[PDB]
Design a protein around this nucleic acid. Structure first.
Lengths: 35, 177, 138, 133
RNA sequence: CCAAGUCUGGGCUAAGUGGUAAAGGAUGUGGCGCCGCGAAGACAGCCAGGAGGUUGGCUUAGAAGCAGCCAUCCUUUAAAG
């Protein structure tokens, strides 16, 4: 969502690279981190 | 510890791995030697807070080390130091630190704290005669109290290259007293 | 570096209006602090503020000391339009000379205050440098 | 294999006792009438029960004794801590009184020694507001 | 395209950056120093208790880590959390 400025929720929410892209991931709809 | 050099070459020297640092002593000096790598380690210990020395040609294995210098530059990485020994029984200009503990008075009960514009202590005890680590803390802290020179409490070597009543270390309201 | 008309004819002799210096708590060794590298008539206000919000998030022991302070100021729109511009003051600060000793998070073991200041940098404006002092930070 | 927090002198409420026990294979009627025997003496204070069944659908087991918090308050003559610990300590006692109160608490205390007995009373004291001086 | 080495040497790119931009992010990648250890046989995997006085103070109508303001100690033992 935040497109710009993502940084680790749940004590897990991972750091993944898709299309060089960095989009938050972690066992929660409440983390759908993306930029 | 070691550190060499002394010719006439600061720029390149003042560059790479070797940082300038004069061979200062009462009566004589000698081109800057040392190195930007030793300074590290040792310095890292506690420059003018303890003391050692290095073996350059076994020349003169003496103490006194630094009485000036600076990591100056913006970056915060020193360059161009001062070095002076002391094989004499005159050692004065002696500035060694002083530590407390945490004695609970204004803190772990009043949350209050205390400024220590002091910390250090440039004095002059028994030349080549000082406990690299001297501690003194009669305790006390809180409300509008303060302690400084005057009182203090000096052991052995009776110097005080300093004065009375002045930046000792008081207790102020980290929030309110 | 355009600066003002004089220290007592245009606008010189103030308090600059702000929120004093020291906070946090002592600490003999532990060198915990902050400085910069950027040049900028440090935005007073912005300034004053900032630092403060700093205390807002911590509270007590961590040299919430801070070695800054503006003392001169700009000016602009007031009068005719754009031409022969007289001067109407507003917004003093101080030159953050391309880096230097900012404010200090100084204390034994109290990073609970390092993070703070941290929060203090975040804020600020001109980027900022996160750092330690003689020894580091314990 | 259940754990409850039933009241005293009231062994017939359907809202808590009903669903919490009936679905676990516990006869609500008979398990209740047995409480009217031991909770009748100390009626008025909430007493936690730990019922443990088997494979016959019965039993009652260990209910208790009572409180052990209010009798300590009767001796000292404080209901509650002053404010926040390590910030307003004002309740000092002595050395000799802390030495004898730990000699009876031994059954549920850490070890049967004398050095380990004085150390627990030091941890639960400073976490509240009773500094030893 | 338009004249002139698809020169040789040794690094770095895996985005077409080059072919305009800042605060700001992230085990990208390549090269440098630190703390702990692998036969008290180490981090991620897996077996288990997943310890007791901890069920302290404001507010309690509920702090009793898993409302929040202050504590932050003791332990009989495989250690502590």
């Amino acid at each position: 969502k935040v497109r710009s400025s993502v940084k680790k929720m749940c004590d897990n929410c991972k750091v993944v690279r898709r299309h060089g892209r960095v989009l938050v991931i972690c066992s929660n709809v409440k983390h759908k981190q993306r930029q | 510890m070691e550190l060499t050099a002394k010719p006439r070459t600061p720029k390149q020297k003042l560059d790479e791995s070797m940082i300038a640092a004069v061979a200062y002593n009462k009566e004589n000096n000698v081109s800057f030697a040392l190195d930007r790598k030793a300074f590290d380690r040792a310095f890292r210990q506690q420059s003018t807070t303890g003391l050692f020395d290095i073996t350059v040609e076994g020349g003169e294995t003496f103490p006194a080390l630094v009485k000036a210098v600076q990591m100056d530059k913006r970056k915060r990485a020193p360059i161009h130091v001062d070095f002076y020994m002391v094989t004499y029984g005159e050692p004065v200009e002696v500035s060694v630190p002083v530590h407390t503990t945490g004695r609970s008075q204004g803190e772990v009960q009043g949350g209050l704290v205390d400024i220590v514009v002091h910390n250090l202590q440039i004095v002059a005890p028994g030349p080549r005669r000082i406990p690299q680590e001297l501690v003194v803390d009669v305790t006390k802290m809180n409300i509008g109290d303060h302690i400084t020179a005057g009182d203090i409490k000096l052991p052995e070597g009776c110097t005080l290259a300093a004065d009375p009543e002045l930046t000792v270390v008081s207790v102020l309201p980290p929030r309110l007293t | 570096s355009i600066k003002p008309t004089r220290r007592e004819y245009i606008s010189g002799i103030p308090g600059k209006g702000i929120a004093q210096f020291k906070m946090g708590n002592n600490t003999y060794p532990a060198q915990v602090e902050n400085v910069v590298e950027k040049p900028v008539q440090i935005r007073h206000n912005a300034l004053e503020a900032a630092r403060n919000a700093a205390n807002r998030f911590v509270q007590n022991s961590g040299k919430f000391r801070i070695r800054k302070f503006p003392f001169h100021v700009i000016r602009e729109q007031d009068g005719d339009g754009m031409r022969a511009p007289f001067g109407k003051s507003v917004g003093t600060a101080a030159r953050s000379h391309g880096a230097n000793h900012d404010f200090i998070a100084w204390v034994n073991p109290d990073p609970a205050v390092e993070f703070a200041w941290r929060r203090a940098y975040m804020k600020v404006t001109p980027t900022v440098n996160i750092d330690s002092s003689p020894a580091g930070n314990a | 294999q259940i754990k409850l927090q039933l009241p005293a002198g009231k062994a017939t409420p359907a809202p808590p006792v009903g669903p919490a026990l009936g679905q676990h294979g516990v006869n609500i009627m008979e398990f209740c009438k047995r409480f009217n025997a031991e909770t009748a003496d100390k009626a008025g204070m909430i007493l936690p029960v730990v019922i443990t069944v088997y494979e016959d659908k019965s039993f009652t087991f260990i209910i208790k004794t009572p409180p052990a918090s209010f009798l300590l308050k009767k001796a000292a003559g404080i209901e509650k801590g002053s404010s926040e610990p390590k910030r307003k300590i004002v309740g000092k006692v002595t050395r000799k009184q802390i030495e004898e109160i730990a000699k009876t608490k031994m059954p549920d205390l850490n070890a049967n020694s004398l050095e380990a007995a004085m150390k627990i009373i030091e941890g639960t004291a400073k976490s509240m507001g009773i500094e030893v001086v």
